[PDB]
């Protein structure tokens, strides 16, 4: 039940990856971690890695929430993709770097038909080789439900502030 990793663990995983799709959520906005995030991506793609951003239509707490913040952080528009055109890319991604998202990934939207999140379309982060989730604790998202993706084989919990944790990961990348 739940393997926990550190900044340095997440650095090794993404440095030794061909493809990484970042997946931002409210948590990223709260911590205001866009700038550290975009720095991580451009030192990630300096290493030859291929980098995308996957934006869920209802990430954050308003429409266009992730978009404004990635825009202030100078993320190119050509790297930013909507759910419907990027959900099949997860199959071929070594890492799904989930930063401050939760509900946006929970596959109880597909499975558990009594769930509050049932029917919602979600990002298929489970299809990636391994998922890195950044959040402070084990609390739920908006929906008040647990995420099964947390305690399963190929997932990794990075316990901290999204801005601090990302900053720390950029440090260990050298």
């Amino acid at each position: 039940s739940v393997k926990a990793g550190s900044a340095e663990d997440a650095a090794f995983i993404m440095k030794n990856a061909s493809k990484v799709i970042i997946v931002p959520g409210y948590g990223m906005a709260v911590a205001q971690a866009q700038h550290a995030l975009r720095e991580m991506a451009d030192v990630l793609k300096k290493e030859g890695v291929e980098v995308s951003y996957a934006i869920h239509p209802v990430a954050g707490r308003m429409p266009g929430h992730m978009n404004v913040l990635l825009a202030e952080a100078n993320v190119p528009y050509d790297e930013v993709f909507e759910l419907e055109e990027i959900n099949s890319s997860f199959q071929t991604a070594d890492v799904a770097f989930v930063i401050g998202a939760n509900d946006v990934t929970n596959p109880a939207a597909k499975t558990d038909p009594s769930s509050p999140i049932y029917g919602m379309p979600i990002l298929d982060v489970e299809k990636a080789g391994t998922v890195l989730f950044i959040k402070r604790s084990m609390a739920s998202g908006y929906a008040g439900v647990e995420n099964e993706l947390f305690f399963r084989n190929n997932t990794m919990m990075l316990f901290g502030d999204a801005k601090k944790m990302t900053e720390q990961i950029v440090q260990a990348m050298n």
């Binding site: 409210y26 906005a29 709260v30 205001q32 239509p57 209802v58 954050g60 707490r61 308003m62 429409p63 266009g64 929430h65 404004v68 913040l69 825009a71 202030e72 509900d103 939207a109 509050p116 999140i117 049932y118 029917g119 919602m120 379309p121 929906a143």
Partner: protein, 358 residues
Amino acid sequence: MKIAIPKERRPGEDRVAISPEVVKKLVGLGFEVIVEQGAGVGASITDDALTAAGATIASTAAQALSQADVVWKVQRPMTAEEGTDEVALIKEGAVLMCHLGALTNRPVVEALTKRKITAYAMELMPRISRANSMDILSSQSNLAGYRAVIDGAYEFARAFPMMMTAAGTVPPARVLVFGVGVAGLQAIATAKRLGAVVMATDVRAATKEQVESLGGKFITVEFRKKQAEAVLKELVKTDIAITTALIPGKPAPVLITEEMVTKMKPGSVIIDLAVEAGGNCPLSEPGKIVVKHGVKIVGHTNVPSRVAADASPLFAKNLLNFLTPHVDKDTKTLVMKLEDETVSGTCVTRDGAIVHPA
């Protein structure tokens, strides 16, 4: 079946309940799709672009609606009691999907009932996760939040951003957003990206996190109403004040009294997004810019329509997302399931009788 989209006839409604991307889908589900000519002109959608997606162009409203089994519009249809009888154009037994404002417009509910129309009030969509794609309250409010900031900046005689120049430095605009629902969060974001210092206040406590997640500062701090002094302290330094606070069915809360506006600096503007429900400012007047004590108090009606070219595609999508799960094989027919909370919470009359609890 046949599905038809008229032109919005109400004064100042530039939106339409269709787009080319949505027409392509409606044909794909088996519909012959008619739209009235000139309906998309407010939204920069020509009749040429509609025809190319698979739509037929009726010449008048009545012709468009005569054999239509489904009808989509943005604002509730007019009654004979307001001088134009649009419910009379809708086919007996047909389905109407639109922003009905049903809980506050009982006359339109009843006029539909007499004609035995099934109407689905889109505003009454249940607040569940899978209904987000159907939800017109958020898609349209979100754009109004953006546009509030654009109207505020239009009226303001200074630049939003700080400017360091050879001739000197002009300071940024300060913006105070009352109410932090969807509209106010997009207001915060648009004021923020334009370079303004942005403040906000909201009576809900868990709003502070939200406001800071967009880079704004929350106005913090028996009778805890010395909070009014914390608001008054910023408002006195504020250039643009944007008020977004509504209460469905009731008059809007007064958040900036005439008393507070007298203490405001000259050249300031108040954008009252709550103006249709009576305003968060009692000095605001629907459809105009009143000036008093040196302050422009702006109160445009129907703000989503001041962004009708993006507002309309999103609205049309909401309608398709609501309807698509209900189309099935059987010689092209829609079958609405009562079990579906999205249908029972939204339906208001069905074949001759009112059905919604309120």
